[PDB]
Write an enzyme that holds these catalytic residues in place. Structure first.
Site, PDB file in Angstrom:
ATOM      1  N   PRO B  87      46.478  39.008  48.911  1.00 49.60           N
ATOM      2  CA  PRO B  87      46.486  40.453  48.727  1.00 49.60           C
ATOM      3  C   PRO B  87      46.047  40.769  47.300  1.00 49.60           C
ATOM      4  CG  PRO B  87      48.727  39.634  48.694  1.00 49.60           C
ATOM      5  CD  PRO B  87      47.838  38.440  49.019  1.00 49.60           C
ATOM      6  N   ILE B  88      44.969  41.528  47.140  1.00 53.34           N
ATOM      7  CA  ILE B  88      44.401  41.914  45.835  1.00 53.34           C
ATOM      8  C   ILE B  88      44.112  43.412  45.897  1.00 53.34           C
ATOM      9  CG2 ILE B  88      42.320  41.734  44.452  1.00 53.34           C
ATOM     10  CD1 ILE B  88      42.473  38.731  44.758  1.00 53.34           C
ATOM     11  N   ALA B  89      44.572  44.159  44.891  1.00 51.60           N
ATOM     12  CA  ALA B  89      44.334  45.614  44.788  1.00 51.60           C
ATOM     13  C   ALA B  89      42.865  45.866  44.529  1.00 51.60           C
ATOM     14  CB  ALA B  89      45.158  46.191  43.667  1.00 51.60           C
ATOM     15  N   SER B 116      46.579  44.524  50.357  1.00 51.22           N
ATOM     16  CA  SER B 116      47.382  45.048  49.243  1.00 51.22           C
ATOM     17  C   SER B 116      47.833  46.482  49.544  1.00 51.22           C
ATOM     18  CB  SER B 116      46.624  45.015  47.959  1.00 51.22           C
ATOM     19  OG  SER B 116      47.318  45.692  46.907  1.00 51.22           O
ATOM     20  N   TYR B 140      55.227  46.422  47.957  1.00 52.44           N
ATOM     21  CA  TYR B 140      56.209  46.329  46.852  1.00 52.44           C
ATOM     22  C   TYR B 140      57.537  46.968  47.276  1.00 52.44           C
ATOM     23  CZ  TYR B 140      52.116  45.027  44.052  1.00 52.44           C
ATOM     24  OH  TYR B 140      51.120  44.292  43.512  1.00 52.44           O
ATOM     25  N   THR B 166      55.904  41.235  47.736  1.00 50.63           N
ATOM     26  CA  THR B 166      55.612  40.736  46.367  1.00 50.63           C
ATOM     27  C   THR B 166      56.791  41.072  45.480  1.00 50.63           C
ATOM     28  OG1 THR B 166      53.313  40.786  46.801  1.00 50.63           O
ATOM     29  CG2 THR B 166      53.953  40.721  44.493  1.00 50.63           C
ATOM     30  N   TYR B 209      53.595  50.379  38.540  1.00 51.75           N
ATOM     31  CA  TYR B 209      54.588  49.277  38.688  1.00 51.75           C
ATOM     32  C   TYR B 209      56.000  49.818  38.422  1.00 51.75           C
ATOM     33  CZ  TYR B 209      51.074  45.450  38.721  1.00 51.75           C
ATOM     34  OH  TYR B 209      50.041  44.613  39.018  1.00 51.75           O
ATOM     35  N   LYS B 235      56.710  36.634  48.076  1.00 51.26           N
ATOM     36  CA  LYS B 235      55.593  36.181  47.248  1.00 51.26           C
ATOM     37  C   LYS B 235      55.928  36.291  45.765  1.00 51.26           C
ATOM     38  CE  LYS B 235      50.667  37.009  46.437  1.00 51.26           C
ATOM     39  NZ  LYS B 235      50.548  37.925  45.285  1.00 51.26           N
ATOM     40  N   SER B 257      53.547  31.429  44.122  1.00 48.23           N
ATOM     41  CA  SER B 257      52.526  32.196  43.399  1.00 48.23           C
ATOM     42  C   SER B 257      53.052  32.559  42.020  1.00 48.23           C
ATOM     43  CB  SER B 257      52.254  33.450  44.205  1.00 48.23           C
ATOM     44  OG  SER B 257      51.266  34.268  43.561  1.00 48.23           O
ATOM     45  N   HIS B 259      50.956  35.018  40.837  1.00 52.01           N
ATOM     46  CA  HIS B 259      50.103  36.224  40.817  1.00 52.01           C
ATOM     47  C   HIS B 259      48.862  35.923  39.997  1.00 52.01           C
ATOM     48  CE1 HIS B 259      51.117  40.724  41.556  1.00 52.01           C
ATOM     49  NE2 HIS B 259      49.906  40.814  40.968  1.00 52.01           N
ATOM     50  N   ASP B 290      49.429  29.877  46.292  1.00 49.93           N
ATOM     51  CA  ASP B 290      48.257  30.357  45.541  1.00 49.93           C
ATOM     52  C   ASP B 290      48.512  30.262  44.038  1.00 49.93           C
ATOM     53  OD1 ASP B 290      49.284  32.733  44.326  1.00 49.93           O
ATOM     54  OD2 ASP B 290      48.674  34.044  46.007  1.00 49.93           O
ATOM     55  N   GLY B 292      45.200  29.811  41.335  1.00 53.91           N
ATOM     56  CA  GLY B 292      44.285  28.855  40.717  1.00 53.91           C
ATOM     57  C   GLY B 292      43.476  28.010  41.681  1.00 53.91           C
ATOM     58  N   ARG B 314      40.593  35.376  43.242  1.00 50.56           N
ATOM     59  CA  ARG B 314      39.473  35.744  42.346  1.00 50.56           C
ATOM     60  C   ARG B 314      38.144  35.227  42.840  1.00 50.56           C
ATOM     61  NH1 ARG B 314      43.654  34.802  38.175  1.00 50.56           N
ATOM     62  NH2 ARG B 314      43.842  36.652  36.862  1.00 50.56           N
TER      63      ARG B 314
HETATM   64  C1  FMN Z   1      42.434  41.647  40.572  1.00 51.08           C
HETATM   65  C2  FMN Z   1      43.746  41.173  41.167  1.00 51.08           C
HETATM   66  C3  FMN Z   1      44.626  42.072  41.713  1.00 51.08           C
HETATM   67  C4  FMN Z   1      45.790  41.643  42.369  1.00 51.08           C
HETATM   68  N1  FMN Z   1      46.564  42.571  43.021  1.00 51.08           N
HETATM   69  C5  FMN Z   1      47.598  42.101  43.721  1.00 51.08           C
HETATM   70  C6  FMN Z   1      48.305  42.960  44.552  1.00 51.08           C
HETATM   71  O1  FMN Z   1      47.909  44.136  44.772  1.00 51.08           O
HETATM   72  N2  FMN Z   1      49.279  42.413  45.362  1.00 51.08           N
HETATM   73  C7  FMN Z   1      49.713  41.119  45.195  1.00 51.08           C
HETATM   74  O2  FMN Z   1      50.668  40.741  45.902  1.00 51.08           O
HETATM   75  N3  FMN Z   1      49.089  40.290  44.368  1.00 51.08           N
HETATM   76  C8  FMN Z   1      48.050  40.743  43.690  1.00 51.08           C
HETATM   77  N4  FMN Z   1      47.314  39.877  42.934  1.00 51.08           N
HETATM   78  C9  FMN Z   1      47.654  38.443  43.005  1.00 51.08           C
HETATM   79  C10 FMN Z   1      46.974  37.721  44.189  1.00 51.08           C
HETATM   80  O3  FMN Z   1      47.587  37.983  45.419  1.00 51.08           O
HETATM   81  C11 FMN Z   1      46.935  36.199  44.039  1.00 51.08           C
HETATM   82  O4  FMN Z   1      48.310  35.739  43.802  1.00 51.08           O
HETATM   83  C12 FMN Z   1      46.127  35.667  42.881  1.00 51.08           C
HETATM   84  O5  FMN Z   1      44.822  36.278  42.946  1.00 51.08           O
HETATM   85  C13 FMN Z   1      45.909  34.174  42.977  1.00 51.08           C
HETATM   86  O6  FMN Z   1      45.355  33.629  41.798  1.00 51.08           O
HETATM   87  P1  FMN Z   1      43.768  33.212  41.721  1.00 51.08           P
HETATM   88  O7  FMN Z   1      43.027  34.392  42.363  1.00 51.08           O
HETATM   89  O8  FMN Z   1      43.491  33.006  40.275  1.00 51.08           O
HETATM   90  O9  FMN Z   1      43.605  31.918  42.514  1.00 51.08           O
HETATM   91  C14 FMN Z   1      46.124  40.281  42.329  1.00 51.08           C
HETATM   92  C15 FMN Z   1      45.275  39.397  41.670  1.00 51.08           C
HETATM   93  C16 FMN Z   1      44.066  39.810  41.152  1.00 51.08           C
HETATM   94  C17 FMN Z   1      43.141  38.787  40.554  1.00 51.08           C
END
Ligand code: FMN
Ligand code: FMN
Lengths: 368, 368
Positions: B87-89, B116, B140, B166, B209, B235, B257, B259, B290, B292, B314
């Site tokens: 999940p990524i915003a 997200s 959240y 999360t 947040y 998470k 994680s 994050h 997750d 890295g 990423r």
């Molecule tokens: C740009 C960005 C935004 C993120 N937003 C969220 C989010 O909205 N919800 C969440 O649970 N984690 C969020 N994360 C964390 C990711 O779910 C995930 O744990 C993280 O990208 C993993 O690390 P890596 O991408 O370096 O491998 C975000 C991470 C990035 C890079």
């Protein structure tokens, strides 16, 4: 020629160690030493017992727990407690009701009966004691493929829901007690008679083990699994590499065991081998653990260390000697009540919580 | 006022590290640094990456393997490879097709999309990309319980088959890049149109947040676990005690994680935390790992260390950073092909075999 106990009664079990000395008073000397004894000077049987002191439980306080639930499930069987009956030959050495009495105790209690290929009771006699209860069949392999197909077919027709391939007894352990007592079976083994041409009465366990397959390979694990269409446990694993091999060769379960120290001498206590095997299995298949379980603390420590269930052996047979099915049942009831106490004191409401326990490392071992 | 890339094309992925530098010559500095950056001086993001060198793979020879199969199952979803989308915003910072683009890649590849709560796309926009593909919803914990009920209902109506709670973001990480850039979201969060009372654009990063729950407790895990009627992953776990607490509070999964190092600074690399957590979880619930994952070797190492699947972050977004752009379906295909090579060289026919790998302990770490 052999006067086994015949009394049927419940017994008050304070602890399972006291059952050995009590059973020694009622079971004929040869048969008792066959059940109780182990390889060499029994140092590895003592290691099985002392291994439990290597990893110690923590009491946990204010855990919001009451009336723990010992129930669990394995291979789609709901069972009352996370223990099953180990496959053990020749129950008639302990009691005249033999495997039918053990099967009655196991089915009345509510867990899985493992049937030894070297049972003195027929499938029909055991089926009567089980009264529909779940059963797994342990194969001591014939050298002849067709005899294996016939044995597997009989067991599955009788209602087996898993196969236990015992692979750790391709030859006998060095059982000094049985050598000194010149111990022979005083009755036949109806399930394996076919590949002993003659009879299992008056034979040593060397020549009966001798008649079974020595050159077991992984192909055997594949072929049992294909023929039966049942999940196959590989029993006797102590080294993590054998667990990985067995799974890659088609095993549906790993049964960590040193055969109650009756096989290889000057080997580790079975519990000491469990974490390395569980880490290598890494959830791929269920793990049954045995060899030295005597207390509810041991069941808890096995689950905390990666076993899904444990298998019970000698204590149940000593209970059978002392009380037939009701005495065997008494031992199963003891383990369930003993575990319930341990669950309360460790903060464990259910069997899954036990799997999550941290253990205290005791590097001083038994003498502390 | 945000000119994200809009070109749709396949990219030849040699490695995912090169995707970060590739992109920023239309691909806006502020949004790129929001995606790429991490807390403090990024030492813990570097630790996420260097942690993979702590445990090294062995090539394993004459293993009788060909055409490895990367498929696996999690919570009854059959998926093409043992990785899912994290999940990524705000995917619109990377590309104008935003979360719908990511969803189409994930669905066409054949794995699970994590949505997200801070998506810039509506569920209906994402749904169009998903085209019936499986999705999990990340929430959240709201201070306002009505808001917890509201988003859990939105999740279930939108066909979510799990909730990702999360927990590790009750306040923002000290993300120096965003502070030095004075980075503000250039668009809204339509899914959580219900919390921010006033404007979403007016709230930069610290206030959003803040409008969410700081005082997350086990009951939050229990209450989500009760209203949702869906499996709940917790998470952000890095300590084994939290994993045990989460499961006892009703979590159906543990999502290991940090994050992507965007939260607590001067913490361990995520992979270094995984074995202690897997040992404590001890099979009770599935583990997602997750933070890295950049290579097929990382996916293999995570599975060998107790994860059921990994989540990708990423590298899939890389439609953005430093140079000229790259990250999508090509990235998912890269990870599948990279993992297939690692499976062949480690003697692994299937994903279960990866779970049984032994790793080499490297005590010298990254500089060797
Ligand atoms: C740009 C960005 C935004 C993120 N937003 C969220 C989010 O909205 N919800 C969440 O649970 N984690 C969020 N994360 C964390 C990711 O779910 C995930 O744990 C993280 O990208 C993993 O690390 P890596 O991408 O370096 O491998 C975000 C991470 C990035 C890079
Ligand atoms: C008297 C006796 C006979 C046994 N016969 C068999 C056998 O027929 N098949 C088998 O797989 N294991 C056999 N075993 C080993 C048990 O399945 C089990 O591994 C062992 O009893 C566990 O050790 P414990 O009873 O000391 O805890 C036997 C063990 C005993 C004590």
């Amino acid at each position: 020629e052999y006067n086994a106990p015949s009394e049927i009664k419940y017994i008050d079990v304070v602890n399972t160690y006291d059952l050995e000395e009590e059973a020694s008073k009622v079971v004929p000397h040869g048969g008792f030493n066959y059940i109780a004894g182990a390889s060499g000077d029994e140092w590895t049987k003592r290691a099985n017992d002392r291994a439990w002191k290597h990893k110690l439980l923590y009491p946990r306080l204010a855990q919001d727990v009451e009336a723990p639930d010992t129930s669990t499930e394995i291979l789609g069987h709901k069972i009352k407690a996370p223990f099953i009956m180990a496959p053990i030959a020749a129950h008639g050495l302990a009691h005249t009701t033999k495997e039918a009495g053990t099967a009655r105790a196991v089915s009345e209690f509510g867990t899985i009966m493992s049937i030894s290929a070297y049972s003195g009771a027929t499938f029909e006699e055991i089926s009567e004691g089980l009264n529909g209860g779940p059963r797994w069949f342990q194969i001591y392999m014939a050298k002849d493929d067709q005899q294996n197909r016939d044995i597997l077919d009989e067991a599955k027709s009788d209602g087996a829901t898993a196969i236990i391939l015992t692979a750790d007894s391709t030859v006998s352990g060095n059982r000094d007690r049985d050598v000194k007592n010149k111990f022979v079976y005083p009755f036949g083994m109806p399930i394996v008679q076919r590949y002993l041409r003659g009879t299992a009465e008056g034979m040593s366990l060397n020549n009966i083990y001798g008649a079974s397959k020595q050159k077991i390979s992984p192909r055997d694990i594949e072929e049992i699994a294909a023929h039966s269409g049942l999940p196959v446990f590989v029993k006797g694993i102590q080294h993590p590499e054998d667990a990985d091999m067995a799974i890659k060769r088609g095993a549906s379960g790993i049964w960590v065991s040193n055969h109650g120290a009756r096989q290889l001498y000057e080997a580790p206590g079975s519990f000491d081998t469990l974490p390395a095997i569980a880490e290598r299995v890494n959830k791929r298949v269920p793990i049954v653990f045995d060899s030295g379980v005597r207390r509810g603390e041991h069941v808890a420590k096995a689950l905390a260390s990666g076993a899904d269930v444990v298998a019970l052996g000698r204590p149940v047979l000593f209970g059978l000697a002392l009380g037939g099915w009701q005495g065997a049942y008494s031992v199963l009831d003891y383990f369930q009540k003993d575990l319930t106490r341990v669950m309360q004191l460790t903060g464990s409401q259910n069997v899954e919580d036990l799997k999550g326990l941290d253990l205290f490392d005791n590097p001083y071992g038994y003498e502390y």
